[PDB]
Amino acid sequence: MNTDVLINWFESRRGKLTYSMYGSRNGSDGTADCSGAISQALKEAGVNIVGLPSTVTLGSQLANNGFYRVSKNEDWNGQRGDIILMSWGADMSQSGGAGGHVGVMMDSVNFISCDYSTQGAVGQAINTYPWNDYYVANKPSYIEVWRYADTAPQTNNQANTAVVPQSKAYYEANEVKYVNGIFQIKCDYLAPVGFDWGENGIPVDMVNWVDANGNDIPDGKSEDFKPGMFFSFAVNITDTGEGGYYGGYYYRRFEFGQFGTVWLSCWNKDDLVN
C-alpha cells in the first residue's frame, strides 16, 4: 500500500469532482461517491480491492488485503492512511446509501473524503476537515478505523502459530478484563494485530491455569486471574470450521459455548489446545 498515492488521489481532485451515488462512483465521469472514491484510491495505491464496494462490504475487503481495525467506536491515535468507515446505524451492515460514509486520515489530525458536506456543489466533493470536528458535526453512531499491516507480505495470511513457532501450546494473558459479563483474556500471540474484546476475548472460565513453564496448576476463581498469568486449553470449545483473513494473518472462528464466537490466529482446534 502506497500511502502517498492514496492521499494524493483525493488531494489532486479538490475542485474537480461532484458528489453522486448515481454515476460512475469513482470519478471517471467527473462524479464519485464516498465508497467509490476510496475504492478507486486504494486500487491506485496498490490494494487489490475488487470492484467498487459500498461501505457495507469494504471492511471485509480491507481485512482480506492486510488491514486490521485499530478502533471500533473508540478514540485512537490517528495516522496517515487510516481508513475510517462510519454508520448512522449500529455497525456497517446498516450503512447503505446515505447511512454510511468513509474517508482517510492524511495525518494524525486531518480527514479527507468524497462527501456531501458542500451539498453537491459542482467540483466540491473532496473536502478536508480535522477529524475531531467532523465527528462532532456529523455524529455517526458507529465508526471503525482500518490500518494496513506493513508485515502483511511476510506473514502472508498464515496463522500466527506458523508465523511465530512455539513448541508448547500454552499462552500468556496480556490483559484480563471483565467484558460482557465475564472475565476475558487478551492474548497477543493469538490475536497479534487489531485485537477487539468482542472478537478475540477468551473466557477465563474456559481456560486451564498453568505456570510460566506450562505446568498444569489448580484453576482459581475467574476474578483472581491476572495479567501476566499463563493458560492452556484442555468439549464446550467448538471449532466452527470457519476461517478468515485479517491484518495479514489467518484467524479461525471458535465458539465457547453460549459465550459466543472467538477468533484466534491458529489453524484449528488441534493447533489451539493441549
Q: Quick one: 28 or 215, whose CB is closer to Na ion?
A: 215
205 binds Na ion (CB under 5 A): no
SS3 182: strand
Task: Give me the amino acid identity at 199.
Answer: E
CB of 116 to Na ion, least distance (A): 57
- Binding residues for Na ion, rule CB under 5 A, total 4
- DSSP character for 89? S
Give me the long-range contacts of 160-169 (CB less than 8 A, separation at least 24): 160/189, 160/190, 160/192, 160/249, 160/265, 160/266, 161/265, 161/266, 161/267, 161/271, 162/267, 163/192, 163/249, 164/189, 164/192, 168/214, 169/232, 169/233, 169/271, 169/272, 169/273, 169/274
* Smallest distance from Na ion to CB 9, Å: 54
Cell 497477543 found at:
188
All three cell numbers of 191, joined, read 490475536
Minimum CB–partner distance for residue 218 and Na ion (Å): 6
The dihedrals phi and psi of 107, each to the nearest 5 degrees, come to: -170, -165
Q: 214, 87 in Cβ contact below 8 A?
A: no
Candidate ranges 28-36, 55-63, 78-86, 207-215; the one touching Na ion (CB under 5 A): 207-215
Residue 208 lies near Na ion (rule: CB under 5 A)? yes
H or E, element range at 208: strand 208-210
Q: Considering the rule CB under 5 A, would residue 24 count as an interface residue with Na ion? A: no
Does the protein bind Na ion through residue 169 (CB under 5 A)?
Answer: no
Asked if 209 touches Na ion (CB under 5 A), the answer is: yes
Does 222 bind Na ion (CB under 5 A)? Our answer is no
Instruction: Give the nearer residue to Na ion in terms of CB position, either 125 or 187.
Output: 187
- Give 105 or 185: the residue with its C-beta nearer to Na ion: 185
Q: Segment contacting Na ion (CB under 5 A): 8-16, 204-212, 223-231, 235-243? A: 204-212
Nearer to Na ion among residue 98 and residue 217 (C-beta)? 217
Half-sphere exposure of 259 (CA within 13 A, CB side): 26
Contact call for residues 164 and 146 (beta carbons, < 8 A)? no
CB of 214 to Na ion, least distance (A): 11
- Could you tell me the smallest distance in angstroms from the CB atom of residue 108 to Na ion? 44
Residue among 19 and 233 whose Cβ is closer to Na ion: 233
User: Does residue 94 bind Na ion (CB under 5 A)?
Assistant: no
Residues that bind Na ion (CB under 5 A): 208-209, 216, 219
